[PDB]
Amino acid sequence: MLDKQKELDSKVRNVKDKVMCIEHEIKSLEDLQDEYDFKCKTLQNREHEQEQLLLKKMYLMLDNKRKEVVHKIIELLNVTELTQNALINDELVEWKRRQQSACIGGPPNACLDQLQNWFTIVAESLQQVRQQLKKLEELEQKYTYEHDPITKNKQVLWDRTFSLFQQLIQSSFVVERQPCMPTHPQRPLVLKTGVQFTVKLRLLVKLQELNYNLKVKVLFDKDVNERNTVKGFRKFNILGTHTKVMNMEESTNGSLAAEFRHLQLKEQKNAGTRTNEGPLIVTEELHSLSFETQLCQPGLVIDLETTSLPVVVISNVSQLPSGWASILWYNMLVAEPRNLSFFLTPPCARWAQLSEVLSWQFSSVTKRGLNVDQLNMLGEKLLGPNASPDGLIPWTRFCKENINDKNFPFWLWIESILELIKKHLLPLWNDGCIMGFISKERERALLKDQQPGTFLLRFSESSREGAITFTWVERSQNGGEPDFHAVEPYTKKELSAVTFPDIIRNYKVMAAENIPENPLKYLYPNIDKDHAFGKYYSRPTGYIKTELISVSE
Amino acid sequence: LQLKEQKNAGTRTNEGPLIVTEELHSLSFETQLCQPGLVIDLETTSLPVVVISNVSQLPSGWASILWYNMLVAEPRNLSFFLTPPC
DNA sequence: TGCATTTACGGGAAACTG
DNA sequence: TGCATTTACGGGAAACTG
DNA sequence: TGCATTTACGGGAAACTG
DNA sequence: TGCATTTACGGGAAACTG
Numbered sequence: 250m251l252d253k254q255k256e257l258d259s260k261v262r263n264v265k266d267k268v269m270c271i272e273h274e275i276k277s278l279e280d281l282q283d284e285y286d287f288k289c290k291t292l293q294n295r296e297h298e299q300e301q302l303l304l305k306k307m308y309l310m311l312d313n314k315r316k317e318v319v320h321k322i323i324e325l326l327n328v329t330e331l332t333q334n335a336l337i338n339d340e341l342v343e344w345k346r347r348q349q350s351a352c353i354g355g356p357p358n359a360c361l362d363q364l365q366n367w368f369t370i371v372a373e374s375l376q377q378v379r380q381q382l383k384k385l386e387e388l389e390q391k392y393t394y395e396h397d398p399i400t401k402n403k404q405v406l407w408d409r410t411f412s413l414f415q416q417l418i419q420s421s422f423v424v425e426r427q428p429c430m431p432t433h434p435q436r437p438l439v440l441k442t443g444v445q446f447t448v449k450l451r452l453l454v455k456l457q458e459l460n461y462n463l464k465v466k467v468l469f470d471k472d473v474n475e476r477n478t479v480k481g482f483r484k485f486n487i488l489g490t491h492t493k494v495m496n497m498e499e500s501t502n503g504s505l506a507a508e509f510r511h512l513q514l515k516e517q518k519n520a521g522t523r524t525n526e527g528p529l530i531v532t533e534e535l536h537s538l539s540f541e542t543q544l545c546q547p548g549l550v551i552d553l554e555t556t557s558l559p560v561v562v563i564s565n566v567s568q569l570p571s572g573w574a575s576i577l578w579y580n581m582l583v584a585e586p587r588n589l590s591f592f593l594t595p596p597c598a599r600w601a602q603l604s605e606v607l608s609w610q611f612s613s614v615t616k617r618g619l620n621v622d623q624l625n626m627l628g629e630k631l632l633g634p635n636a637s638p639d640g641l642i643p644w645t646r647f648c649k650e651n652i653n654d655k656n657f658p659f660w661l662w663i664e665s666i667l668e669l670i671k672k673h674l675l676p677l678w679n680d681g682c683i684m685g686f687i688s689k690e691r692e693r694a695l696l697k698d699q700q701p702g703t704f705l706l707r708f709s710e711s712s713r714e715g716a717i718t719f720t721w722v723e724r725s726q727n728g729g730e731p732d733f734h735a736v737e738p739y740t741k742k743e744l745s746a747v748t749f750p751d752i753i754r755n756y757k758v759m760a761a762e763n764i765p766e767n768p769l770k771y772l773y774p775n776i777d778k779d780h781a782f783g784k785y786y787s788r789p790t791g792y793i794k795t796e797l798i799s800v801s802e
Numbered sequence: 803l804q805l806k807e808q809k810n811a812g813t814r815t816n817e818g819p820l821i822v823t824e825e826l827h828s829l830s831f832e833t834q835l836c837q838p839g840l841v842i843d844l845e846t847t848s849l850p851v852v853v854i855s856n857v858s859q860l861p862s863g864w865a866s867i868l869w870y871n872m873l874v875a876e877p878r879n880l881s882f883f884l885t886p887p888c
Numbered sequence: 889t890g891c892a893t894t895t896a897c898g899g900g901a902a903a904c905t906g
Numbered sequence: 907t908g909c910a911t912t913t914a915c916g917g918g919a920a921a922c923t924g
Numbered sequence: 925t926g927c928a929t930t931t932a933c934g935g936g937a938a939a940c941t942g
Numbered sequence: 943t944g945c946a947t948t949t950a951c952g953g954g955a956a957a958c959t960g
Contacts, residue, residue, distance in 0.1 A: 432896090432898085441897095442912090444896085444897070445896085478878075479877075516912090523905095523906080524905070524906075524910095524911080525906075526905075526906045526909080526910060526911085527906075529877060531910080531911095532910090532911080563911095564911065564912050564913080565898095565899085565900095565911080565913085566897090566898065566899075567899080567900085567911095568911085582885065583885065586820060586884055588881060588884055588885055590879060590881050591885060593877055593879055594873065594874065594879055594882060594885070594886070594887050595885070595887070596885050596886070596887055596888070597888045641888060643888065807948090814941095814942080815941070815942075815946095815947080816942075817942045817947085818942075822946080822947095823946090823947080854947095855948050856934095856935085856936095856947080856948070856949085857933090857934065857935075858935080858936085858947095859947085890924100891923105891924095892922100892923090892924090893922085893923090893924105894920100894921080894922075894923100895919100895920080895921070895922085896918105896919095896920085896921090897917105897918095897919095897920100898916105898917090898918090899915105899917095900914105900915095900916095901914090901915095902912105902913085902914080902915105903911100903912085903913075903914085904910100904911080904912075904913085905910090905911090905912100906908100906909095906910090926960100927959105927960095928958100928959090928960090929957100929958085929960105930956100930957080930958075930959100931955100931956080931957070932954105932955095932956085932957090933953105933954095933955095933956100934952105934953090934954090935952095935953095936950105936951095936952095937949100937950090937951095938949085938950080938951105939947100939948085939949075939950085940946100940947080940948075940949085941945105941946090941947090942944100942945095942946090
């Protein structure tokens with residue numbers, strides 16, 4: 250809350266008051282050297298037409314007041330140093346980290362407004378200290394003597410006031426909108442060759458002489474030494490328009506920003522790399538959007554620069570699954586140090602951490618996360634029966650290695666099940682009709698509930714296509730549990746044709762010459778079919794009305 | 803062959819950076835076979851090496867040199883230790 | 889304002905190259 | 907010879923312009 | 925060949941700097 | 943203010959040179 254905010258805020262007011270105060274001291278010293286100027290110029294030449302002492306004890310004030318002002322700036326400059334080091338190395342940086350998790354999902358970033366203010370104030374303040382150190386240069390260019398406080402301190406002050414300004418604006422040059430392909434907006438670091446993508450750059454020092462003065466250029470792969478070093482590094486060019494100027498218009502509420510839309514990638518086919526298909530790394534190699542500008546002004550020549558997160562470049566959205574996986578791991582295990590190498594030797598991760606992303610994945614697409622009992626099934630497919638919340642999962646196990654006894658990676662499994670929900674199961678899954686994830690052990694042992702006629706929902710473990718199914722229970726006459734029952738898993742193909750709910754309504758099972766049954770009555774604990782999934786049902790010389798229907802035996 | 807440090811402030815020896823002394827460095831070599839019509843440039847490089855001041859350190863260090871030489875093919879991953887494996 | 893036409897992209901499959 | 911990646915095109919929907 | 929003298933390094937502790 | 947690293951020096955052993 251206002252734990253550090255209130256601290257930092259008090260320190261910026263502090264700076265702002267200590268600039269005002271210096272300015273009253275400049276005005277009273279601007280007066281007292283004119284008064285002496287008047288009284289000395291009528292007294293030096295005076296015989297052309299009770300003791301007292303005005304010329305000996307008052308002149309002292311043109312020393313004393315110059316020492317008080319000069320010492321009083323240094324005190325301000327020291328204070329601005331501390332305020333600035335907190336602002337830069339704590340307040341921005343921790344907004345950053347926040348950002349890198351609003352990529353991969355989770356809690357949303359707050360605005361930049363609060364940070365802009367602190368920036369801007371600390372920058373107007375240092376602009377005012379610049380002018381006052383030039384009114385001091387002007388008083389020295391009128392009257393100078395033996396020990397002049399503003400001749401020993403003139404250059405050390407000027408040099409510090411700039412050294413501070415530079416550091417201040419250079420850190421103000423940030424990326425507001427991490428690059429993204431508009432059509433895939435929860436997936437914002439994965440580029441495709443020959444779609445358009447968009448970025449936006451934000452400057453924090455909202456000054457108004459910085460309007461139509463900064464033209465921000467976009468580069469690709471600038472100063473990436475993996476190109477030379479790694480074997481098989483692709484190269485690419487950007488294609489939209491690169492050069493924009495940064496304007497206070499467009500983006501409302503000031504915000505000296507630039508949003509470049511219509512950015513594209515194309516590959517530079519020049520053999521060259523020769524596309525070695527025995528190098529280090531596949532496509533999980535990382536790349537990097539770079540930006541760059543320069544604040545030109547009378548006496549002021551600052552070079553700005555900044556850089557996107559690591560980005561991944563693909564050809565086909567057959568890839569983008571895999572890719573995203575990259576972008577999770579990275580954004581999950583890493584501070585910022587553009588480790589473009591990461592994946593040569595990629596770390597492990599803590600099942601207590603991974604878990605919270607896995608949640609995030611579904612919570613981002615939909616309106617409902619992975620609850621506890623569902624993570625337990627997953628960690629256990631990753632770890633093994635001892636699913637400590639400290640166990641380490643290796644990046645292979647996650648993404649490029651077949652699980653226990655199946656022919657597909659563990660992400661590439663979840664990747665499909667998410668998809669299925671996003672296009673065929675939103676309602677049932679925002680309204681928690683699906684158990685989804687469960688082991689075909691603690692299913693049976695939770696169906697020794699009720700009426701020979703309860704059924705879960707499950708996602709199937711044995712597809713790669715992601716395919717939902719249902720499980721239900723009978724009475725076998727032996728005085729116990731049934732062999733239970735579950736059905737061949739219902740994938741997209743089927744669900745394309747008739748909706749999953751509607752499968753449910755009208756499930757059959759049949760015989761030669763026997764009336765057909767309906768073994769689905771009660772969903773989990775006790776809920777009548779025709780209640781849970783009531784509300785999704787579709788609808789309730791002259792053609793006759795047909796349906797589709799799912800049927801066993 | 804000897805090492806000496808180039809004290810020029812410069813780095814300013816930040817004692818809040820990434821990595822301690824397990825940073826890796828690298829001996830590089832280089833020559834050229836000149837001959838009538840033949841002008842070849844040769845080059846090669848040591849393993850990653852670790853540089854210390856005092857053999858109060860060399861324990862720690864060795865530890866570096868185990869991990870690296872144990873988990874790695876050759877690709878001079880000079881970064882390793884920013885994000886070192888298991 | 890509405891309709892015709894063009895565009896941009898997703899997705900599947902074949903073509904490429906190491 | 908097989909697998910990894912890219913390219914090509916069809917369809918569908920959105921965008922554009924008269 | 926043997927002895928004197930100097931050298932190089934290991935190790936501990938204090939000094940440095942962020 | 944504390945911790946990380948470097949530097950400084952003493953001792954011991956080896957090397958060097960007459």
